[PDB]
């Protein structure tokens, strides 16, 4: 998916060409690097003007802190946000799918595969260090569960019990569960 596609007058790269139209393709699992690039892109796109930012996600997973940073940047910008799911949204990608446009602007392709699970993490040290890290990670689970529950409309206690293991969904299950809002078809 490299070839620069022609723009208004010149040859510009495919992903830069997309962002010229506010479209932000996220295609890699969210590591520090991709998250920083997408946070920067979101901030600059909101800088140009305020129309709307569509995020097309193919995320197969990712790390928790960078994903929450990207979420907070999406919420901070003036322009609204819509998230479409081309391919699949797993874990923190399935959390980003519930990060933009609560009012009926989450779409998914018909065979997109959706998955949510409680955020992972790992850290060791002293005893007290493990206390501090464990308390922080429990705070993180609770925050992401509050966000998931207020995004989908499911009870907080239900979400806690559901996401402890992996949770997989077809787009029909995702509409019925409240994860997304519409499924893209030929139109």
């Amino acid at each position: 998916c490299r070839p620069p596609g022609q723009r208004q007058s010149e040859w510009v790269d495919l992903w830069e060409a997309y962002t010229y139209q506010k479209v932000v393709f996220i295609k890699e699992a969210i590591t520090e690097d991709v998250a920083n690039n997408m946070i920067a892109l979101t901030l600059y796109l909101d800088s140009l003007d305020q129309k709307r930012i569509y995020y097309w996600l193919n995320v197969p997973g990712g790390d928790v802190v960078p994903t929450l940073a990207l979420y907070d940047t999406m919420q901070y910008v003036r322009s609204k946000t819509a998230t479409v799911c081309y391919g699949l949204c797993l874990g923190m990608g399935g959390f980003l799918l519930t990060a933009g446009g609560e009012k009926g602007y989450r779409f998914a392709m018909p065979h997109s595969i959706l998955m949510m699970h409680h955020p992972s993490g790992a850290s060791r040290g002293q005893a007290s260090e493990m206390h501090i890290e464990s308390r922080e990670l429990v705070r993180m689970r609770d925050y992401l569960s509050l966000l998931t529950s207020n995004a989908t409309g499911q009870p907080y206690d239900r979400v806690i019990r559901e996401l402890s293991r992996n949770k997989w969904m077809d787009p029909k299950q995702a509409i019925e569960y409240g994860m997304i809002d519409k499924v893209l078809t030929t139109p």
Binding site: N58, Y86, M109, H111, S112, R165, N166, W168, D170
Partner: protein, 133 residues
């Protein structure tokens, strides 16, 4: 005006084949899909994703069809959950093949079981392709 997809892919993850199949169906003007040499599973899905009536295979080309693969790791219940999704993937791939070949879905599931090879003419007859170059 019609996406003309030349296919020559010895392999790939089946989920990516599904994703490319969905991307193909997304655009409304038809898609031509010409396979050269080989079209394995992730590309066999792409080949079956072209416009019925406009999917071509070459005399030398061979089509691979197989069930998805996966590695799992974790507790017993994690393994159970992950097995359930791989089964969902295999069922979806059988459904896509059924839509393109108009053949019993259970029969297509039986044929997916192990690695399945089709010559160009068997690709035509099965239904993944329509004509020979």
């Amino acid at each position: 005006k019609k996406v003309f997809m030349i296919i020559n892919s010895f392999g790939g993850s089946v989920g990516n084949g599904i994703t490319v199949h969905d991307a193909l169906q997304f655009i409304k003007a038809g898609s031509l899909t010409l396979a050269l040499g080989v079209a394995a599973s992730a590309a066999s899905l792409a080949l079956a994703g072209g416009t019925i009536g406009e999917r071509y295979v070459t005399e030398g080309c061979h089509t691979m069809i197989h069930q998805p693969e996966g590695g799992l790791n974790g507790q017993a219940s994690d393994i159970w959950i992950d097995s359930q999704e791989i089964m969902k993937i295999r069922l979806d791939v059988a459904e896509i093949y059924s839509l393109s070949t108009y053949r019993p879905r259970h029969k297509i599931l039986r044929d997916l079981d192990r690695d399945f090879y089709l010559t160009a003419m068997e690709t035509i007859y099965y239904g993944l392709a329509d004509e020979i170059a």
